[PDB]
Structures are given as structure tokens and as C-alpha cells.
Amino acid sequence: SGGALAGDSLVTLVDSGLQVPIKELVGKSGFAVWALNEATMQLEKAIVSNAFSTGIKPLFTLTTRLGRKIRATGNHKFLTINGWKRLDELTPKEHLALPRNSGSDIYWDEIVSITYSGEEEVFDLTVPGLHNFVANNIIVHN
Ligand SMILES: [Cl-]
Ligand SMILES: [Cl-]
Ligand SMILES: [Cl-]
Ligand SMILES: [Cl-]
Ligand code: NA
Ligand code: NA
Ligand code: NA
Numbered sequence: 001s002g003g004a005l006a007g008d009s010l011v012t013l014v015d016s017g018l019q020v021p022i023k024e025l026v027g028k029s030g031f032a033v034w035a036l037n038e039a040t041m042q043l044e045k046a047i048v049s050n051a052f053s054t055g056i057k058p059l060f061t062l063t064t065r066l067g068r069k070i071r072a073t074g075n076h077k078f079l080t081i082n083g084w085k086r087l088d089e090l091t092p093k094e095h096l097a098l099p100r101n102s103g104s105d106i107y108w109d110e111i112v113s114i115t116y117s118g119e120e121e122v123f124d125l126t127v128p129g130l131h132n133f134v135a136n137n138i139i140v141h142n
Contacts, residue, residue, distance in 0.1 A: 001142075002075065002076070002077065002124070002141065002142050003072060003073040003074075003075040003076030003077065003086075003087075003124070004054045004057060004072070004073050004076065004122035004123055004124045005022055005070065005071065005072050005073075005076065005122060005123055005124065005135055005140070006022075006059055006070075006071035006072070006120055006122060006123075007021055007022060007023030007120065007121055007122070007123055008021045008022075008023070008071075009021065009022045009070060009071065009072075009123070009135045009136050010022075010135065010136055010137075011025065011033050011125070011133060011134065011135050012033060012034055012134065013031060013032070013033065014032040014033060014034065014045045015032070022051065022123045022124075022125065022135065023053075023121075023123055025048070025051040025123075025125070026051050026052060026053060026123065027051065027052075028048075028051055029048060029049050029050060029051070030047065030048075030049070031047070031048055032045045032046060032047055032048070033045075033046055033048055033125070033127070033133045033134065034046065034099065034133065034134040035127055035129075035130040035132050035133045035134065035139075036079070036097065036106065036130065036132055036134075036139050037130060038079075038130075038132075041105070041106055042104040042105065042106075043099055043104040043105075043106070043134070044104075044130065046127050046129055046130050046132075046133060047127070047128070047129065048125045048126065048127055048133070049126045049127070049128050050125065050126040051123065051124075051125050051126075052123065052124060052126075053121055053122070053123050054122055054123065054124055055121065055122070056119050056120060056121050056122070057073050057119060057120075057122045058073065058074065058116065058118070058119050059071045059072065059073060059116075059117050059118060059119065059120055059122065060072060060073075060074060060087055060088070060114055060115060060116055060117060061113070061114070061115045061117040062078075062087060062090070062111060062113070062114050062138075063111070063112050063113045063114075063115075064096065064098065064109040064110060064111055064112060064138070065109055065110040065111075065112050066098070066109050068098060068109065068136060068137050068138050069136060070135060070136040070138050070140070071117055071120075072087050072140065073087070073122055074086060074087050074088035075087070075088065076140060076141075077140065077141040078090065078096045078097075078138065078139065078140060078141070079096060079097040079132075079139050079141065080094060080095060080096060080097075081095060081108060084141050087114065090111060090114060091111075092111065092112075092113075092114075093110055093111065094110075094111050095108040095109060095110050095111070096108065096109055096111060096138065096139070097139045098137060098138050098139060099134055099137060099139070106139070124142070125142075126142060127142055
């Protein structure tokens with residue numbers, strides 16, 4: 001529930017640092033990825049309790065000014081300076097929270113494009129602590 005991501009969306013397994021397509025994690029649990037602690041605004045290790053397909057749904061490709069890109073359902077939420085917002089409520093030039101290249105801080109990158117990009121099978125992770133995770137180096141909410 002809450003939206004989903006293209007199967008090739010990459011999540012980072014904390015200990016190995018291996019970037020893995022979310023589709024490959026289906027059925028796995030009890031492993032850590034990166035997530036945002038919104039109180040500290042710092043990245044933290046977060047346990048995933050479930051990884052699953054939600055079926056075939058419409059996807060939108062969102063691209064940022066730094067060149068980060070993700071394909072998500074219209075209802076998937078991203079973090080703006082004014083709170084979490086559905087992809088299909090985001091506007092051109094609106095900024096989203098993204099992890100910095102190094103360290104545990106975030107930066108607010110500008111959206112340069114949102115484009116409908118067809119239907120595919122889509123996937124999600126449940127993160128029972130922080131309810132969000134990093135995918136394709138962008139913070140997304142459950
Ligand atoms: Cl678990
Ligand atoms: Cl379906
Ligand atoms: Cl909806
Ligand atoms: Cl919204
Ligand atoms: Na490591
Ligand atoms: Na604010
Ligand atoms: Na705007």
C-alpha cells in the first residue's frame with residue numbers, strides 16, 4: 001500500500017554496500033537498507049520486514065537536476081520541504097530530499113522532469129521503523 005517502484009529500482013544493502021534491484025528482494029526479510037530519520041534529517045540503517053509485488057501499474061519517470069532518476073507510481077510519496085507528497089502532486093522545479101554522495105546528510109534537489117513511462121510490474125518494501133527507504137539514491141515513503 002502507498003505506492004510502488006519499478007523492479008529495476010536499486011536499493012543498497014547496508015553491510016555489503018551492494019545495490020540490488022528491488023524485484024530481486026521479493027520474499028526476503030530481516031535485512032537493512034538506508035532510510036531517513038526525519039527527526040535528525042540523517043540517514044540511518046533500517047530493517048526491511050517484507051518485499052513484494054503489488055501488480056502491474058502505471059509508472060512515471062522522475063528526474064532531478066543532479067541527474068538522479070526513478071520510476072514510481074503516481075501515488076508514491078517523496079519528501080519536499082513542505083512535507084511528503086505524491087509524485088502526481090509534484091510540480092516542475094519542486095525540490096525533493098536526496099542523500100548526499102557521502103556522509104549521512106540530505107540535500108534538496110530540483111525536479112527537472114516528470115514523464116509518464118508506461119505500465120510494468122511494481123514492487124515495494126515495508127520498513128516498519130522509519131517507513132521510508134532510499135531507492136535509486138532518492139528518499140521514498142511507504
Ligand atoms: Cl524483519
Ligand atoms: Cl495487476
Ligand atoms: Cl491513488
Ligand atoms: Cl500529496
Ligand atoms: Na561494507
Ligand atoms: Na518545512
Ligand atoms: Na513548481
